[PDB]
Each structure stands twice: as structure tokens, then as C-alpha cells.
Amino acid sequence: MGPAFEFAVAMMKRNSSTVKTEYGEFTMLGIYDRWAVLPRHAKPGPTILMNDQEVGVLDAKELVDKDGTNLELTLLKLNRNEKFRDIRGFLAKEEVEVNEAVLAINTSKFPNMYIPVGQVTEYGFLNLGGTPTKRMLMYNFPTRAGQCGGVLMSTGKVLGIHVGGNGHQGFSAALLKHYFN
Amino acid sequence: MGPAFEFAVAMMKRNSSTVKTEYGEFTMLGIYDRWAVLPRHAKPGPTILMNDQEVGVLDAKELVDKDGTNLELTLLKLNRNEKFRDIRGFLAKEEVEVNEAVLAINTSKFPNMYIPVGQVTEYGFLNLGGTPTKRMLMYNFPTRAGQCGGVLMSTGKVLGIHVGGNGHQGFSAALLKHYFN
Ligand SMILES: *[C@@H](CC(=O)OCC)[C@H](C[C@@H]1CCNC1=O)NC(=O)[C@H](Cc1ccccc1)NC(=O)[C@H](CC(=O)OC(C)(C)C)NC(=O)OCc1ccccc1
Numbered sequence: 001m002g003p004a005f006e007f008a009v010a011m012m013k014r015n016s017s018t019v020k021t022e023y024g025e026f027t028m029l030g031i032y033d034r035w036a037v038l039p040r041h042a043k044p045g046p047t048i049l050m051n052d053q054e055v056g057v058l059d060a061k062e063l064v065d066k067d068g069t070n071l072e073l074t075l076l077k078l079n080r081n082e083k084f085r086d087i088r089g090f091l092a093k094e095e096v097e098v099n100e101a102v103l104a105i106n107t108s109k110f111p112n113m114y115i116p117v118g119q120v121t122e123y124g125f126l127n128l129g130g131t132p133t134k135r136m137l138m139y140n141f142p143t144r145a146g147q148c149g150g151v152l153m154s155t156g157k158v159l160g161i162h163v164g165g166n167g168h169q170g171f172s173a174a175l176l177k178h179y180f181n
Numbered sequence: 182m183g184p185a186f187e188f189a190v191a192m193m194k195r196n197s198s199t200v201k202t203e204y205g206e207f208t209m210l211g212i213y214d215r216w217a218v219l220p221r222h223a224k225p226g227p228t229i230l231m232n233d234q235e236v237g238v239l240d241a242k243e244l245v246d247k248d249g250t251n252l253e254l255t256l257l258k259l260n261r262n263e264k265f266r267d268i269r270g271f272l273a274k275e276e277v278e279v280n281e282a283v284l285a286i287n288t289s290k291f292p293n294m295y296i297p298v299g300q301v302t303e304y305g306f307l308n309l310g311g312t313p314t315k316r317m318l319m320y321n322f323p324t325r326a327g328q329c330g331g332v333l334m335s336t337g338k339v340l341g342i343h344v345g346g347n348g349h350q351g352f353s354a355a356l357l358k359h360y361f362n
């Protein structure tokens with residue numbers, strides 16, 4: 001898992017920030033240009049707090065699949081002149097299944113912490129926060145509040161964003177290449 | 182830092198546990214035979230909770246240097262028939278200074294989380310919890326309550342146990358080979 005950790009630390013240094021919304025504090029991953037992602041439940045307002053700084057939300061697409069089903073990601077275009085290093089090349093075209101993964105968190109609660117969550121398997125459909133939801137990836141780790149937005153990685157791969165947990169497993173929504181125009 | 186992470190994950194799997202004392206929940210590192218360490222302020226009682234299990238404390242040496250000064254470690258001999266894999270070979274004879282380190286935490290608050298804290302320099306004397314204290318190692322990371330007992334490592338090396346923080350830096354007490362008979 002050494003190279004996975006090394007990839008994660010560099011990714012999070014390069015592309016991540018800490019976001020507060022009216023619904024809480026989350027890890028946020030910048031993808032390319034000016035577009036970042038959060039879990040849908042961050043319910044980002046017209047302004048967010050990004051590393052303690054007010055930033056405007058030029059647009060915010062909550063994502064769903066063709067059968068209108070919940071995917072639990074919101075994409076945001078940020079009013080800022082700096083551009084995110086482009087990490088679309090790191091995003092798979094479909095759900096990745098991995099034997100060793102790292103979940104990386106960047107909040108006030110969990111500043112730069114990394115968790116080896118072990119095996120990620122494709123879980124697909126889950127009833128999450130009561131909402132039917134697809135394209136879920138599952139790892140057996142006791143995830144808590146304060147970990148949403150967590151970025152799930154393996155060597156060379158950005159697999160998903162942490163969005164939920166039942167107290168015993170956690171679930172990332174798959175960050176698919178095609179979500180990004 | 183890849184190999185440091187890989188060393189840490191294996192160390193913590195092999196030698197660490199979660200301890201609750203009347204003073205809180207800590208990460209605990211088993212050293213050899215039946216002897217483990219905590220920060221002195223864990224103030225371990227005649228019984229501890231180790232991974233949720235009552236265990237007796239056959240002896241408990243709080244450590245100080247020759248000038249009676251605070252080192253902020255308590256060594257404990259545990260009433261249990263399992264033996265700790267012997268990691269004394271991993272403990273330096275004097276304070277190690279490192280450019281990249283990992284701090285590894287194992288509590289209910291922070292279960293298996295790892296933090297790259299970067300550069301560790303020898304700090305020696307610090308006024309800690311108001312107590313004069315020596316053999317301190319310092320890293321620039323915002324450490325919090327719930328991280329004491331944290332094990333600070335680099336590839337192949339167990340450097341110290343996390344014992345304090347001022348909100349901006351954290352401090353480990355050096356885990357020296359000679360402390361272990
Ligand atoms: C991220 C929020 C955060 O970081 O806080 C910012 C301050 C949080 C992380 C998970 C919650 C507990 N552990 C986690 O890893 N996610 C959520 O809170 C998420 C919110 C949400 C909102 C809107 C739509 C979907 C999701 N909700 C869940 O993860 C839920 C929480 C829950 O209700 O379950 C427990 C109370 C933890 C048991 N998890 C969930 O729905 O699991 C499936 C389930 C629940 C009940 C019965 C059967 C199956």
C-alpha cells in the first residue's frame with residue numbers, strides 16, 4: 001500500500017481543500033479547470049467556505065443516472081481564477097474494484113489523515129440516507145460523520161468520494177470520467 | 182513516504198491496541214514480552230480497558246531522566262498470556278531526527294488513521310501541561326485530543342509516542358531502547 005499512500009498524499013496536496021457549507025464541513029476534490037465535487041448532501045449554497053474563504057458557486061449539478069436514480073455527487077464550478085490541476089486522467093470509465101485502497105480526509109476534524117480501508121468491491125445499489133442510490137463502492141471500515149468528501153484512491157487511481165456509512169461499512173460514490181464534460 | 186506508511190500499518194497491526202483509562206482513550210504500543218507504553222497522563226489505573234477488555238496492570242513505571250525530569254511515558258506490564266512481538270530492535274538509542282515521518286492513531290475517535298507530519302526535529306526541553314519535559318520531538322502538525330499514544334514512525338524506525346500539542350505543533354516523547362530492560 002506504500003505507493004497508494006504516496007499517490008494519495010500528493011493528490012490531496014495538489015487537488016483537495018476543506019469546505020464548509022450550511023450542512024457541514026467536508027473534504028472537496030478539485031477535478032479540472034474550475035470544477036470541484038462534493039457529496040450531494042453537502043447541499044452547497046450560493047457561497048461556500050473554502051479553506052476558510054468565501055467562494056461563489058457559478059453552477060451546481062447534483063448528479064443522477066439515466067433512470068433518475070441517486071448517485072450522491074454534486075459538481076460545482078467555483079468563482080476563482082486559479083485552476084485545478086487536471087486529474088480526469090485518473091478517473092475510471094466504470095467502477096473500479098481494488099484489493100488495497102486509501103481513504104484520504106482533509107477537514108478541521110480530520111486534518112490530513114489517511115486510512116487504509118483495504119478491499120473495495122463494487123456494491124452498486126444501496127438504500128442511503130433512505131435514498132436509493134447506485135454506483136456505490138464498499139469497504140469494511142468504521143467510517144463516521146466528518147469523513148464525507150473523503151477521497152478513495154489506489155496507486156494511480158481516483159476511485160470515488162466518501163458519502164456514507166452504516167457504522168460498520170463505508171460507501172463512496174464512483175467518480176466516473178464521463179461525469180466530467 | 183510510501184515505505185514509512187507501509188512500515189506503520191504493519192507495526193500498528195502487529196503491536197498496537199486501543200486503551201481506555203479513567204483519564205481517556207489512547208493508542209497503546211506493545212513493545213516486547215508483556216510490556217506496553219502509554220503517555221504518562223493516561224494515568225493508567227490498576228485495571229485498563231484494552232480493545233474493550235479489562236486487563237490488569239502488574240506494574241507501572243512512570244519515566245524520568247537522571248535529573249528527575251519529566252519524560253512523559255508510563256511503561257506497563259500487562260496481566261496477559263499473549264506476548265508482544267519484540268520491537269526493541271526498532272527503537273533508537275537516542276533521539277532520531279527525520280525529514281518524513283508518519284504519526285499512526287488507533288482509537289474510537291481515530292481508528293486506523295495515519296498522518297504524514299513531515300519533518301521531525303529534536304526539541305528536547307518543553308514546558309508541557311505546565312511540566313518541564315525533555316527528550317521531545319517536534320513536528321508541525323495541528324494535533325488534537327484523542328491522539329495521545331499516537332506512534333511516530335519512519336521507514337524501519339519507531340521514534341516516539343505522541344504526548345502533547347499546543348494547537349499548532351505536536352510533540353512525541355522519544356521511545357529509547359534503553360528504557361526497556
Ligand atoms: C458524511 C457527513 C459529514 O462528513 O459531516 C459533515 C459535518 C456522513 C458520513 C457517514 C455517516 C455515518 N458514517 C459515515 O460514514 N454521511 C452522511 O451523513 C450521509 C448523509 C446523507 C444525506 C442525504 C442523502 C444520503 C446520505 N448518510 C449516511 O451515511 C447514512 C447515515 C445513517 O442514516 O445510518 C446510521 C445512522 C449511521 C446507521 N447511512 C445510511 O443510510 O446507511 C444505510 C442504512 C441505514 C439504516 C438502515 C439500513 C441501511
Ligand SMILES: *[C@@H](CC(=O)OCC)[C@H](C[C@@H]1CCNC1=O)NC(=O)[C@H](Cc1ccccc1)NC(=O)[C@H](CC(=O)OC(C)(C)C)NC(=O)OCc1ccccc1
Nearest residue numbers: 205206222309310311324325326327328329344345346347
Ligand atoms: C492527548 C490526550 C488524549 O489523546 O485524550 C484521550 C481522551 C493530548 C494531545 C494534545 C492536547 C492538545 N493537542 C494535543 O496534541 N495531550 C494532552 O492533553 C497533554 C496532557 C498532559 C497531562 C499531564 C502532563 C503533560 C501533558 N497536554 C498537552 O498537550 C498540553 C495541552 C495544553 O495545555 O495546551 C493547549 C491548551 C492545547 C494550548 N499542551 C501544552 O502544554 O503545550 C505547551 C504550552 C502550553 C501553554 C503555553 C505555552 C506552552
